[PDB]
Design a binder for this molecule. Structure first.
Ligand SMILES: *[C@@H]1O[C@H](CO)[C@@H](O[C@@H]2O[C@H](CO)[C@@H](O[C@@H]3O[C@H](CO)[C@@H](O)[C@H](O)[C@@H]3O)[C@H](O)[C@H]2NC(C)=O)[C@H](O)[C@H]1NC(C)=O
Lengths: 99, 194, 49
């Protein structure tokens, strides 16, 4: 939690990587007027990256003032984020592969 | 909305020799409601018969006019959502403490880079239309906000050592008043372009 | 109207020049302003300690 520059560059350039992936991924789709399955997947993943950065921002803001809170939200996120992304993937794949 | 027409005239015969009308006069054009465009949506079609007047006489004419209303959800999802979220992500640097120089520089400058990348890849994906458009105005607005956020950080860093109090006051004011200005910009833009 | 001389003879030629002026408003906000803001941002680096 105390390595602010490393975590900040990590998150922000992860967002930039996601942006490049989204842009490259939409160069294949025909210009439809609505969201494809891959569009939902990309938007959800992009939101996850944005939320991880926001989580780090909260941790940094409450560190040095409520370090108990900062460590508590870190330990909670380590178990929340993947446990929510995995179930999202399961539901998405289950709904789309069976149609 | 793009009003796209089809004009039907007679080349050599004037109204003194030939007269045009729609057979049915309201059902003459069929199959239009069943048209499924990928990017638009026919909201209405009109049938207009008339006689146009030129020098050597009046020539008959019919006109089939479609009104195509462009679907928006795609453009939202692909262009606006990334830019808005990158603007917010640029804002994130304000909650990062003043000492975190490398952190706030990384965030702001990478947000500028990402905004440039989005702009210069949508410049290719979008049709090449060499005059200014509302999408371009919005992308410029987001870029200018990222620019202002990074300049605000630069000001804070410059004036800090002389007066932490004013540094922190500036930081808090910007924290409270860039979201305000961004909402104001969004409201004016979306109400002016709709 | 003019006369063109070629290896085959002299021919009448009816010319019509159409005069066009390019718009700038797109390149202004699409290249010039991003470039100017990038240079301004590069200079702003001097204000940091
Ligand atoms: C797309 O644009 C064209 C061009 O303006 C629209 O055609 C216009 O439609 C209106 C409504 O039918 C016409 O007004 C009519 O004028 C006649 C004059 O003889 C009058 O008798 C009618 O009572 C009515 O006032 C207008 O003339 C016509 N313009 C042209 C140049 O044909 C068309 O409606 C648009 N497409 C849409 C709305 O889907």
């Amino acid at each position: 939690r105390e390595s602010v520059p490393a975590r900040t560059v990590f998150g922000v350039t992860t967002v930039l990587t996601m942006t490049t992936l989204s842009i490259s991924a939409r160069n294949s789709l025909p210009k439809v007027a609505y969201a494809t399955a891959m569009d939902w997947f990309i938007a959800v993943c992009y939101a996850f990256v944005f939320s991880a950065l926001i989580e780090f921002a909260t941790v940094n803001y409450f560190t040095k003032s409520q370090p108990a809170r900062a460590a508590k939200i870190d330990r909670l996120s380590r178990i929340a984020f993947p446990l929510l992304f995995g179930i999202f993937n399961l539901v998405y794949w289950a709904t789309y592969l069976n149609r | 909305e793009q009003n796209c027409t089809l004009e039907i005239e007679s080349y050599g015969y004037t109204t003194d020799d030939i007269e045009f009308y729609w057979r049915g006069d309201d059902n003459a054009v069929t199959g239009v409601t069943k048209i499924e465009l990928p990017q638009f949506s026919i909201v209405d079609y009109k049938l207009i018969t008339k006689k146009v007047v030129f020098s050597t006489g009046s020539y008959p004419r019919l006109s089939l006019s479609f009104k195509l209303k462009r679907n928006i959800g795609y453009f939202i999802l692909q262009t606006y959502m990334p830019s808005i979220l990158i603007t917010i992500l640029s804002w994130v640097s304000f909650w990062i403490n003043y000492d975190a120089s490398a952190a706030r520089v990384a965030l702001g400058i990478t947000t500028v880079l990402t905004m440039t990348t989005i702009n210069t890849h949508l410049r290719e994906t979008l049709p090449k239309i060499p005059y200014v458009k509302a999408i371009d105005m919005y992308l410029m607005g987001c870029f200018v906000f990222v620019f202002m956020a990074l300049l605000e950080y630069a000001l804070v860093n410059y004036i800090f050592f002389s007066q932490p109090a004013r540094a922190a006051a500036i930081d808090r004011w910007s924290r409270i008043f860039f979201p305000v200005v961004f909402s104001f910009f969004n409201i004016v833009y979306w109400l002016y372009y709709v | 109207s003019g006369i063109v001389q070629s290896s085959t003879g002299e021919y009448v030629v009816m010319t019509t020049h159409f005069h066009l002026k390019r718009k700038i408003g797109y390149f202004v906000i699409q290249t010039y302003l991003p470039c100017i803001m990038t240079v301004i941002l590069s200079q702003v680096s001097f204000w940091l300690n």
